[PDB]
Amino acid sequence: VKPGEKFDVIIVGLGPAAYGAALYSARYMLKTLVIGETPGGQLTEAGIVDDYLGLIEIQASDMIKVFNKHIEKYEVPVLLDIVEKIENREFVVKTKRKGEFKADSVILGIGVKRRKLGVPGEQEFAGRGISYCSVADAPLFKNRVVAVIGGGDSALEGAEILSSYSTKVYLIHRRDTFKAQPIYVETVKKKPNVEFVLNSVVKEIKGDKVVKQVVVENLKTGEIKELNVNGVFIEIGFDPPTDFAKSNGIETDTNGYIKVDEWMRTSVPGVFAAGDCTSAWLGFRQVITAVAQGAVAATSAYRYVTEK
Amino acid sequence: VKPGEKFDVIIVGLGPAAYGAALYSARYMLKTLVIGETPGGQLTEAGIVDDYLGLIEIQASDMIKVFNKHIEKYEVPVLLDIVEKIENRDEFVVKTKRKGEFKADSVILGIGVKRRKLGVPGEQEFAGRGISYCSVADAPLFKNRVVAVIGGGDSALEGAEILSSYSTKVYLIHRRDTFKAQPIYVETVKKKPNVEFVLNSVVKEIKGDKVVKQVVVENLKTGEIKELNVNGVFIEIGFDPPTDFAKSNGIETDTNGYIKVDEWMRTSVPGVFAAGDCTSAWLGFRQVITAVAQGAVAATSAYRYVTEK
Ligand SMILES: Cc1cc2nc3c(=O)[nH]c(=O)nc-3n(C[C@H](O)[C@H](O)[C@H](O)COP(=O)(O)OP(=O)(O)OC[C@H]3O[C@@H](n4cnc5c(N)ncnc54)[C@H](O)[C@@H]3O)c2cc1C
Ligand SMILES: Cc1cc2nc3c(=O)[nH]c(=O)nc-3n(C[C@H](O)[C@H](O)[C@H](O)COP(=O)(O)OP(=O)(O)OC[C@H]3O[C@@H](n4cnc5c(N)ncnc54)[C@H](O)[C@@H]3O)c2cc1C
C-alpha cells in the first residue's frame, strides 16, 4: 500500500481485536488496511494461552502467527506503524512514518498499555516466573507459593483465582488500603491462604533460572522480608488511550476508555472500536472477547460503509 | 456425577456458548457440570468454518471435536441429556430428562436457537452440496458463481448484500410482495446491478447432479414457473428463540422472544446467566466467535456471583 490510497476500512492496531476485525472486514469484501505498531499486542508478553477455545495450550507467539496467517489468507495489507491522527475531511488516517491514508470508516483496536512496575529482577526473570496475567497463568501455579503485586480490581481478582490454585498468595501493595471494590477485598480477606502485605513494595525479584524469592520492604516501618515464591504476578493495571481519544475527538467514559455502544460504535459516526481500549466489558481483558468485539466492529463498519 | 450432587455452576447446552462458558468456569475452579443435548449445537449442520480466528478452514465437525477436547482437558463432566426445568429454591435445582436432578448455585444457559425450516424438495438431498444456511459464512466460496437467497428479513437481505460482492448474480427470492427487512437494507441492496429481486415467489424445487444446478421458482401472482440456473442456494429464513423455555423457567425475554440479558450476560433471575444465540445481545449477529466470547462473559459473571454468595 502507498500513501494516499483509499480503503473502505482502516483498522488501527495489531492485537486480537484488530485481527478479529480484519478477518470479518476482509470477508465482507471491504477493502481493508490494518495499521498497527506491535504484532500481537499484549500477547507479545504472554506465555501459553489456554483459554481461547479450540487452540489448546498454544504458545502466545504461535497464536500471533496463526492469527496473522488467517487474515493474510484474505490478503489484508498490514502496515507496521503508529497512527497519530484521525481526521474527518471521509477519514484521513495519519501515520508516524508511512504517510496519510484515506478511509470511509475506521476501527480502533488500540488496546491498553500495561502500567509498568520496573523493579530489579523483572527483566531478568521475564518468562521465568513472572506473569502479567493471573487469570491466564494461575492454572500453572497449582500448589506453588506466589506473590501478586497491585491493589486494584486486577490484583484482587488475581489473588482470588491464585488463592484457589496456589499454596498461598502474598498480595503486596504500596498503599495502606486496597483501592479495589469492597466485595473483592472482602472475598479475598476470607481466604486463609492469602496474606495482605500492605504499605509495601517489592525491592527485588530473585532466582536462579526461575524466580525463587521476592524481597519486600514496608514503606512505613522499613522492615525488609524475603519471601520464597515460585511466581510473581504483576497486576498494577493498564492505561486506556484517553489521550489518543481526546486528541481525535472521540468520547471517553469516565474511566478513560473509548466509549462504545453495543455495536462497537464510538461517538464519531464511522469510527468503531473493539477490544480492551473500549468501555465494553470493562475490566475483562481476554483474547476471546477482543476477537469477538472485532467481529462486531467490522460488522458495524460494513453496515456503515455499505449504507453510506 | 450422580443425582442430587451440587455444583457451583451448571451450564445448559453443548454448543459454542456452553463450551466457551465451560472452559472459563473450569479455569476459575468452579465445580462445573455441563448438560447438553446435541454436542456442537448448530455446528452439526455447518460446513467449513473460516471466520473463527486462528482455526483456519476448519470443518465444523472438527471444530466440535476440538472444542470438546479442550473442555475435557479440564475434566469437565458432560451429561448428554435434555434439561427439563430449572427450579429457583437458596439454590437451583436443574431437572433432566434421564439423569436425575442436580443442584447448583448458579446456572448458565447456552441453549441456542432452532433454525426455522423451509423444507423444499431437494433441500435435504443437497445439504453440503450447494445449499447453505449462512451467507456470512459461505459467501466467499461463491465468487464468480450464481446464487439464490431465499428469505425476506434482515438475514436474507444482508446475505444478498454480501453475496453481491462475490457472486456474478444473486437472485433474492421471497414469497411476499415486499420484504420485511429493515427498509435501509432493502434500499441498499436494490442498487446492486447484480442482485435481482424475485418477490411474490416460492422455490418449488432445488435440483442438481453431484451439486446444486437449479432452482425451480413459482411466481405466486402470475402463476409462472421458471427454472433458474444457480451454483448455490442460501436459505435465510430465520430462527426460533427459546421463548417457551424462558417462560417456563421464569426468565424474562426481550421484545423478540430472546432471553434478555444485560451487558454481563445476566438474565432477569439472579444467579442465572445466558450466552450465545439464545440471548438478546448482538441480536441478529450469530457467530461462533461471539457465542464463545459471551460464554466466557457468562462464566465470569457466574464466578463473581458464586464467589460473592
Ligand atoms: C502478559 C499477558 C498475558 C495474557 N494472557 C492472556 C491469555 O492467556 N488469555 C486471554 O484471554 N487473555 C490474555 N491476556 C489479555 C489479552 O492478551 C488482551 O485482553 C488482549 O490482547 C487485548 O487485545 P486488544 O487487541 O484489544 O489489545 P492489545 O493486545 O493491547 O493490542 C493493541 C494493539 O494496538 C496497537 N496500537 C496501539 N496504539 C496504536 C496506534 N496509535 N497506532 C497503531 N497501533 C497502535 C498495539 O501496538 C497493538 O498492536 C494477557 C495479557 C497480558 C498482558
Ligand atoms: C448451517 C449453519 C452454518 C453456520 N456456519 C457458521 C460459520 O461458518 N461461522 C460462524 O461463526 N457461525 C456459523 N453459524 C452460526 C453459529 O453456528 C451459531 O451462532 C452458534 O453455533 C451459536 O452457538 P450457541 O452455543 O449459542 O447455540 P447452539 O449452537 O444453537 O447450541 C445450543 C445448545 O443447547 C442445547 N440445548 C438446547 N436446549 C437444551 C435443553 N433444554 N437441555 C439441554 N441442551 C439444550 C443444544 O442441543 C445445543 O447443544 C452457522 C449456523 C448454521 C445453522
Side-chain angles (χ1 to χ4, degrees):
Chain A
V1 296
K2 276 85 182 171
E5 190 172 350
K6 189 164 175 174
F7 296 87
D8 290 321
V9 65
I10 288 177
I11 293 167
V12 183
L14 198 54
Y19 289 120
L23 177 59
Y24 272 73
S25 291
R27 288 173 41 86
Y28 283 130
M29 272 307 298
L30 292 166
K31 186 183 176 196
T32 303
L33 169 69
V34 177
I35 308 173
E37 181 182 15
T38 303
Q42 288 171 59
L43 291 175
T44 61
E45 297 193 303
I48 299 169
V49 182
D50 199 34
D51 57 8
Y52 186 87
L53 186 74
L55 289 176
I56 299 173
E57 296 165 347
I58 189 167
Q59 291 292 320
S61 60
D62 290 322
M63 170 172 273
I64 293 165
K65 288 172 185 183
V66 77
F67 285 179
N68 176 255
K69 283 172 185 295
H70 207 161
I71 66 159
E72 296 305 81
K73 174 183 159 165
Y74 291 96
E75 301 174 37
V76 174
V78 174
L79 178 70
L80 303 180
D81 203 3
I82 294 164
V83 167
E84 311 252 61
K85 209 72 187 197
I86 296 172
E87 283 161 22
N88 189 314
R89 183 124 173 219
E90 66 185 347
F91 293 100
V92 173
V93 177
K94 302 182 171 185
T95 70
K96 185 177 163 187
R97 162 191 46 173
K98 312 186 173 173
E100 283 185 358
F101 301 87
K102 298 165 181 186
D104 274 339
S105 65
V106 175
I107 298 173
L108 303 178
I110 60 176
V112 296
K113 271 197 155 182
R114 181 166 64 70
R115 293 180 187 128
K116 285 182 190 173
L117 189 67
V119 291
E122 187 172 357
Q123 269 185 34
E124 171 172 23
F125 292 99
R128 305 160 85 84
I130 301 174
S131 170
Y132 294 103
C133 190
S134 301
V135 299
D137 298 330
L140 306 185
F141 290 81
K142 290 172 191 215
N143 295 313
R144 302 297 177 216
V145 175
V146 301
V148 172
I149 303 177
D153 287 356
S154 301
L156 275 289
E157 289 183 68
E160 166 66 31
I161 187 176
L162 287 160
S163 80
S164 297
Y165 283 92
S166 303
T167 299
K168 178 179 182 182
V169 180
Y170 287 98
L171 176 54
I172 306 164
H173 180 52
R174 65 185 179 179
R175 307 306 189 185
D176 193 61
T177 57
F178 292 112
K179 65 181 164 180
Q181 303 191 60
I183 186 60
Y184 288 161
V185 179
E186 295 308 301
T187 295
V188 176
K189 191 187 144 178
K190 282 159 170 165
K191 301 292 187 186
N193 70 328
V194 175
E195 175 172 326
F196 288 168
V197 188
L198 286 158
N199 294 303
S200 303
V201 294
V202 168
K203 287 192 125 199
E204 169 178 23
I205 296 169
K206 317 200 313 187
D208 55 308
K209 297 177 298 176
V210 297
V211 171
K212 291 181 159 174
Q213 294 183 295
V214 293
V215 178
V216 179
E217 164 152 45
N218 184 303
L219 299 178
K220 286 193 168 181
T221 74
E223 174 190 49
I224 297 287
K225 319 179 185 161
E226 274 205 68
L227 301 173
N228 295 309
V229 298
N230 308 295
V232 177
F233 293 79
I234 298 169
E235 297 274 9
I236 61 163
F238 290 76
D239 288 327
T242 316
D243 293 340
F244 178 93
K246 290 194 176 186
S247 168
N248 292 291
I250 294 160
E251 278 183 22
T252 51
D253 69 2
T254 49
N255 306 296
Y257 287 73
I258 293 173
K259 185 67 175 75
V260 294
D261 66 8
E262 181 182 340
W263 292 102
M264 298 300 120
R265 291 178 286 214
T266 72
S267 63
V268 176
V271 180
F272 309 87
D276 50 36
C277 70
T278 74
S279 61
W281 292 333
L282 191 180
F284 189 51
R285 298 183 182 97
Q286 305 291 321
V287 179
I288 190 74
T289 52
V291 175
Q293 289 176 331
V296 176
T299 298
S300 294
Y302 173 73
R303 290 166 179 176
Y304 174 88
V305 168
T306 61
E307 287 164 30
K308 172 195 186 183
Chain B
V1 296
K2 266 78 187 193
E5 185 174 1
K6 184 166 188 175
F7 296 81
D8 292 320
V9 62
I10 292 180
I11 295 169
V12 185
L14 199 51
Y19 288 119
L23 176 59
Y24 272 69
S25 68
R27 286 175 50 86
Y28 286 132
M29 274 185 64
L30 290 176
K31 186 182 172 183
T32 309
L33 171 63
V34 176
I35 306 166
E37 184 185 14
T38 302
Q42 291 171 56
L43 287 177
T44 61
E45 296 191 294
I48 306 303
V49 178
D50 203 33
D51 57 9
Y52 186 86
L53 186 75
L55 287 181
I56 301 170
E57 289 176 15
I58 190 169
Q59 287 263 42
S61 58
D62 290 325
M63 173 174 268
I64 298 170
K65 289 185 194 198
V66 74
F67 286 179
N68 179 256
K69 178 177 176 152
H70 203 164
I71 67 164
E72 293 308 71
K73 196 176 67 86
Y74 282 92
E75 300 179 16
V76 174
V78 176
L79 291 176
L80 298 181
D81 199 8
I82 291 164
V83 166
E84 302 290 1
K85 203 78 173 60
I86 294 168
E87 171 181 48
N88 188 349
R89 184 171 191 182
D90 174 58
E91 72 193 349
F92 298 98
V93 180
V94 175
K95 308 175 178 183
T96 72
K97 177 173 181 163
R98 310 191 57 154
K99 277 57 218 300
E101 319 187 331
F102 302 92
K103 291 179 161 150
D105 278 315
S106 65
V107 176
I108 296 172
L109 304 175
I111 60 175
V113 296
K114 310 275 185 73
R115 181 171 62 72
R116 292 176 190 141
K117 302 188 173 185
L118 186 62
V120 297
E123 183 179 356
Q124 47 185 24
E125 289 70 28
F126 286 98
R129 300 191 286 155
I131 291 178
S132 172
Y133 295 102
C134 192
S135 299
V136 301
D138 294 329
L141 303 174
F142 288 81
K143 185 176 182 178
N144 298 312
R145 296 160 85 191
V146 177
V147 299
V149 177
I150 306 181
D154 289 342
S155 70
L157 269 293
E158 189 165 70
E161 174 89 354
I162 301 163
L163 281 158
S164 76
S165 294
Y166 286 103
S167 301
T168 304
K169 188 179 177 93
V170 181
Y171 292 106
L172 175 53
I173 305 171
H174 179 54
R175 68 197 170 189
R176 309 297 186 167
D177 187 56
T178 57
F179 293 114
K180 58 191 181 178
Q182 297 172 49
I184 181 58
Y185 291 155
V186 175
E187 297 308 291
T188 300
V189 172
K190 205 173 191 172
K191 303 201 173 212
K192 301 293 184 174
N194 67 332
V195 176
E196 180 183 315
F197 289 173
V198 186
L199 286 155
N200 299 300
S201 297
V202 296
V203 174
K204 297 305 187 195
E205 180 182 22
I206 293 171
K207 306 192 317 177
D209 190 11
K210 288 194 301 205
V211 299
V212 168
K213 287 175 168 174
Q214 289 182 305
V215 286
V216 179
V217 178
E218 178 199 349
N219 182 294
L220 301 183
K221 291 206 157 191
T222 69
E224 162 203 62
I225 292 287
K226 64 164 99 166
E227 288 199 52
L228 299 173
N229 293 320
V230 294
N231 300 279
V233 178
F234 284 76
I235 299 170
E236 296 279 14
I237 62 160
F239 297 77
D240 291 326
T243 310
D244 291 346
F245 181 95
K247 278 169 180 169
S248 167
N249 295 286
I251 297 160
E252 286 173 22
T253 52
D254 68 6
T255 61
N256 297 293
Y258 287 75
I259 290 170
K260 172 45 204 192
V261 293
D262 65 7
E263 154 162 45
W264 289 98
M265 297 304 116
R266 307 184 187 158
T267 72
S268 65
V269 178
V272 181
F273 308 87
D277 285 10
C278 71
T279 76
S280 59
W282 295 327
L283 212 192
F285 195 49
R286 303 180 175 92
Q287 304 291 309
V288 181
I289 188 71
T290 57
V292 176
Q294 291 172 336
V297 179
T300 305
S301 292
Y303 170 61
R304 292 172 178 175
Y305 176 87
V306 175
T307 64
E308 284 187 34
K309 183 183 179 183

mmCIF file of all heavy atoms in Angstrom, chain A residues 137-156:
data_model
loop_
_atom_site.group_PDB
_atom_site.id
_atom_site.type_symbol
_atom_site.label_atom_id
_atom_site.label_comp_id
_atom_site.label_asym_id
_atom_site.label_seq_id
_atom_site.Cartn_x
_atom_site.Cartn_y
_atom_site.Cartn_z
ATOM 1 N N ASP A 137 -2.430 -17.378 33.830
ATOM 2 C CA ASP A 137 -1.433 -18.306 34.307
ATOM 3 C C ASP A 137 -1.653 -19.001 35.630
ATOM 4 O O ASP A 137 -0.868 -19.870 35.954
ATOM 5 C CB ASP A 137 -0.063 -17.613 34.319
ATOM 6 C CG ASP A 137 0.374 -17.174 32.939
ATOM 7 O OD1 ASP A 137 -0.016 -17.828 31.961
ATOM 8 O OD2 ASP A 137 1.094 -16.180 32.861
ATOM 9 N N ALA A 138 -2.704 -18.641 36.349
ATOM 10 C CA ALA A 138 -2.941 -19.274 37.668
ATOM 11 C C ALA A 138 -2.922 -20.800 37.610
ATOM 12 O O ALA A 138 -2.355 -21.456 38.504
ATOM 13 C CB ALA A 138 -4.247 -18.797 38.268
ATOM 14 N N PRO A 139 -3.520 -21.408 36.564
ATOM 15 C CA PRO A 139 -3.508 -22.868 36.500
ATOM 16 C C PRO A 139 -2.120 -23.477 36.417
ATOM 17 O O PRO A 139 -1.958 -24.689 36.624
ATOM 18 C CB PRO A 139 -4.325 -23.155 35.232
ATOM 19 C CG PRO A 139 -5.292 -22.033 35.191
ATOM 20 C CD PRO A 139 -4.377 -20.863 35.493
ATOM 21 N N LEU A 140 -1.121 -22.660 36.100
ATOM 22 C CA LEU A 140 0.243 -23.135 36.003
ATOM 23 C C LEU A 140 1.001 -23.050 37.327
ATOM 24 O O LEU A 140 2.170 -23.433 37.412
ATOM 25 C CB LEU A 140 1.006 -22.362 34.922
ATOM 26 C CG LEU A 140 0.372 -22.340 33.514
ATOM 27 C CD1 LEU A 140 1.329 -21.649 32.560
ATOM 28 C CD2 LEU A 140 0.086 -23.757 33.031
ATOM 29 N N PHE A 141 0.318 -22.551 38.360
ATOM 30 C CA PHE A 141 0.946 -22.418 39.672
ATOM 31 C C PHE A 141 0.214 -23.168 40.762
ATOM 32 O O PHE A 141 0.194 -22.750 41.924
ATOM 33 C CB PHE A 141 1.117 -20.941 40.022
ATOM 34 C CG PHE A 141 2.152 -20.283 39.193
ATOM 35 C CD1 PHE A 141 1.850 -19.834 37.904
ATOM 36 C CD2 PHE A 141 3.455 -20.192 39.640
ATOM 37 C CE1 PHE A 141 2.854 -19.301 37.077
ATOM 38 C CE2 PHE A 141 4.453 -19.671 38.837
ATOM 39 C CZ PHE A 141 4.139 -19.221 37.537
ATOM 40 N N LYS A 142 -0.354 -24.302 40.401
ATOM 41 C CA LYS A 142 -1.041 -25.163 41.347
ATOM 42 C C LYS A 142 -0.051 -25.594 42.421
ATOM 43 O O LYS A 142 1.051 -26.039 42.133
ATOM 44 C CB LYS A 142 -1.547 -26.423 40.654
ATOM 45 C CG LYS A 142 -2.660 -26.151 39.716
ATOM 46 C CD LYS A 142 -3.000 -27.375 38.909
ATOM 47 C CE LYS A 142 -3.952 -26.954 37.796
ATOM 48 N NZ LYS A 142 -4.953 -28.007 37.493
ATOM 49 N N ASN A 143 -0.481 -25.433 43.668
ATOM 50 C CA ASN A 143 0.328 -25.804 44.819
ATOM 51 C C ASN A 143 1.713 -25.201 44.848
ATOM 52 O O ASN A 143 2.664 -25.817 45.280
ATOM 53 C CB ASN A 143 0.366 -27.340 44.979
ATOM 54 C CG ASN A 143 -1.018 -27.900 45.298
ATOM 55 O OD1 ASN A 143 -1.723 -27.396 46.161
ATOM 56 N ND2 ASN A 143 -1.432 -28.930 44.562
ATOM 57 N N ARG A 144 1.808 -23.964 44.375
ATOM 58 C CA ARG A 144 3.039 -23.201 44.472
ATOM 59 C C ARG A 144 2.737 -21.954 45.320
ATOM 60 O O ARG A 144 1.580 -21.536 45.430
ATOM 61 C CB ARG A 144 3.545 -22.709 43.096
ATOM 62 C CG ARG A 144 3.814 -23.791 42.071
ATOM 63 C CD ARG A 144 4.912 -24.672 42.598
ATOM 64 N NE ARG A 144 5.216 -25.798 41.722
ATOM 65 C CZ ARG A 144 5.556 -26.997 42.185
ATOM 66 N NH1 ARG A 144 5.620 -27.198 43.496
ATOM 67 N NH2 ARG A 144 5.845 -27.989 41.347
ATOM 68 N N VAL A 145 3.754 -21.377 45.935
ATOM 69 C CA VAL A 145 3.598 -20.139 46.717
ATOM 70 C C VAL A 145 3.857 -18.983 45.729
ATOM 71 O O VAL A 145 4.829 -19.026 44.947
ATOM 72 C CB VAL A 145 4.598 -20.112 47.884
ATOM 73 C CG1 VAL A 145 4.546 -18.784 48.628
ATOM 74 C CG2 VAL A 145 4.244 -21.243 48.872
ATOM 75 N N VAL A 146 2.969 -18.006 45.716
ATOM 76 C CA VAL A 146 3.103 -16.910 44.761
ATOM 77 C C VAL A 146 2.866 -15.549 45.408
ATOM 78 O O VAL A 146 2.326 -15.414 46.509
ATOM 79 C CB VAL A 146 2.082 -17.067 43.597
ATOM 80 C CG1 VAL A 146 2.299 -18.399 42.875
ATOM 81 C CG2 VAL A 146 0.666 -16.921 44.094
ATOM 82 N N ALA A 147 3.311 -14.513 44.710
ATOM 83 C CA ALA A 147 3.092 -13.135 45.102
ATOM 84 C C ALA A 147 2.340 -12.420 43.985
ATOM 85 O O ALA A 147 2.587 -12.694 42.790
ATOM 86 C CB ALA A 147 4.421 -12.422 45.292
ATOM 87 N N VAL A 148 1.419 -11.553 44.386
ATOM 88 C CA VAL A 148 0.674 -10.684 43.467
ATOM 89 C C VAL A 148 1.014 -9.269 43.907
ATOM 90 O O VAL A 148 0.905 -8.913 45.076
ATOM 91 C CB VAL A 148 -0.814 -10.860 43.595
ATOM 92 C CG1 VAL A 148 -1.550 -9.788 42.744
ATOM 93 C CG2 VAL A 148 -1.209 -12.253 43.146
ATOM 94 N N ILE A 149 1.427 -8.443 42.946
ATOM 95 C CA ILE A 149 1.759 -7.039 43.203
ATOM 96 C C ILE A 149 0.653 -6.165 42.600
ATOM 97 O O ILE A 149 0.363 -6.236 41.397
ATOM 98 C CB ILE A 149 3.107 -6.669 42.573
ATOM 99 C CG1 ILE A 149 4.212 -7.593 43.105
ATOM 100 C CG2 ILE A 149 3.446 -5.214 42.887
ATOM 101 C CD1 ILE A 149 5.598 -7.341 42.473
ATOM 102 N N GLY A 150 0.032 -5.352 43.435
ATOM 103 C CA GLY A 150 -1.051 -4.469 42.985
ATOM 104 C C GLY A 150 -2.138 -4.295 44.019
ATOM 105 O O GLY A 150 -2.156 -5.039 45.016
ATOM 106 N N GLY A 151 -3.063 -3.358 43.800
ATOM 107 C CA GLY A 151 -4.100 -3.114 44.780
ATOM 108 C C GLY A 151 -5.473 -2.763 44.252
ATOM 109 O O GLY A 151 -6.381 -2.421 45.031
ATOM 110 N N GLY A 152 -5.641 -2.852 42.937
ATOM 111 C CA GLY A 152 -6.950 -2.588 42.365
ATOM 112 C C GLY A 152 -7.677 -3.882 42.061
ATOM 113 O O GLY A 152 -7.273 -4.966 42.505
ATOM 114 N N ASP A 153 -8.764 -3.784 41.319
ATOM 115 C CA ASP A 153 -9.532 -4.941 40.945
ATOM 116 C C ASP A 153 -8.698 -6.035 40.286
ATOM 117 O O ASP A 153 -8.904 -7.215 40.623
ATOM 118 C CB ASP A 153 -10.670 -4.520 40.017
ATOM 119 C CG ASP A 153 -11.776 -3.784 40.754
ATOM 120 O OD1 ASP A 153 -11.737 -3.651 42.005
ATOM 121 O OD2 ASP A 153 -12.721 -3.343 40.056
ATOM 122 N N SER A 154 -7.784 -5.679 39.385
ATOM 123 C CA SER A 154 -6.945 -6.668 38.695
ATOM 124 C C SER A 154 -6.179 -7.528 39.717
ATOM 125 O O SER A 154 -6.152 -8.775 39.607
ATOM 126 C CB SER A 154 -5.910 -5.983 37.761
ATOM 127 O OG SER A 154 -6.507 -5.155 36.741
ATOM 128 N N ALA A 155 -5.533 -6.865 40.671
ATOM 129 C CA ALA A 155 -4.761 -7.582 41.672
ATOM 130 C C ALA A 155 -5.623 -8.389 42.610
ATOM 131 O O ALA A 155 -5.247 -9.511 42.940
ATOM 132 C CB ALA A 155 -3.936 -6.616 42.482
ATOM 133 N N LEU A 156 -6.766 -7.873 43.034
ATOM 134 C CA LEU A 156 -7.601 -8.627 43.961
ATOM 135 C C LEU A 156 -8.217 -9.829 43.281
ATOM 136 O O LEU A 156 -8.295 -10.894 43.861
ATOM 137 C CB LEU A 156 -8.684 -7.747 44.609
ATOM 138 C CG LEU A 156 -8.252 -6.962 45.866
ATOM 139 C CD1 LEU A 156 -8.057 -7.954 47.060
ATOM 140 C CD2 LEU A 156 -6.954 -6.204 45.649
#
